[PDB]
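Re: export button greyed out
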Amino acid sequence: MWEQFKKEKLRGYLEAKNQRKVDFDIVELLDLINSFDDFVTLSSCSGRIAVVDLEKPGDKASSLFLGKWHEGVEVSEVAEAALRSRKVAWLIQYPPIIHVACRNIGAAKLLMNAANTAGFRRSGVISLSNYVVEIASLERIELPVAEKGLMLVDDAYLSYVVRWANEKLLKGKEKLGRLQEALESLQRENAYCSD
Amino acid sequence: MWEQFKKEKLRGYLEAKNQRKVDFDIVELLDLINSFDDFVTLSSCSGRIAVVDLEKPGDKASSLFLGKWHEGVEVSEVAEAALRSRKVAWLIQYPPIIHVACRNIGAAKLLMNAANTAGFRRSGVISLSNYVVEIASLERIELPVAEKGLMLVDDAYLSYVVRWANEKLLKGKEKLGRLQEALESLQRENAYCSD
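Workaround output, generated via the alternate export path:
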């Protein structure tokens, strides 16, 4: 059952790589994870900062992305997006989130422990069925900044909340890098020895 | 091992109830949870809105609570707190979070499924050891509103973000109520029948 399950999920990942529908900056991590026998990736996001045009907060049905960045962003990029709002522009920082199915309870514990080592608090098994571990962090810089193309906050305040968003996104990338290291250190234990 | 583990943890909960160190509005839920043989509560928060005086964002070491509410808050209460800041006052909404140890994998799956039924996305096993299930939600209204007793945002904007915070806190309480119902519906199956 596990090998057939992993083949199905891995086919989904390879199709997303072919369609260029995987965050370029964690293709390595995800490849690495899938190179363990007892893991298969399900989904991932390496973290982002966005500006989203929203009628009401949490109204995902009204939502339109005004701008989206997988890396640190200039205050200027953010204002630019916000000035294009037709409803309320929200600045949103999404931290990294990875889902990995694990073959058994020991494999889940291994991955959870590495995630924790890397600094991902709030990592957990979100489905016991195929021990799907979520590796994640607390998910809310989320604040309104413009309405119908007009700013709600002054340039100083915008600058402050963007710098903060940048700094959080970077810390997410740091933790992703550490997790890749940890898994690489693990995986490469006998890279230079047959025995 | 489980009964000795549960006795230790339950003693911690009863001591916190005696010291009035448990959120009054989920004493019922937590009691109910502890009335299952296969569960024991570890910790909980029923959700809150706070204003916190912070040097930098996430600088928990500089943090001082200027105001804290377990229920919906008047915009006026929030401004009042913020005006007392000596550093940067942040408005923070914390959603409900419950930790429950479960006796076996079936018990974990049961609790996770009820939590999901109630609307707690992002519920998971955060330690496989004693199947500690975290019941929780996404945790960030978090924004700066005053500095050294002076407002950074206008009254309209403050009103808007407080209303939003109120609405999120209420939805957390709704989900807590639903989870208590679900567990009660479960627990009371043979309340009126010996057989």
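Residues 2-195 of chain B form a domain with the SSo0622-like fold fold (CATH 3.30.1960.10). The button fix ships in the next patch.
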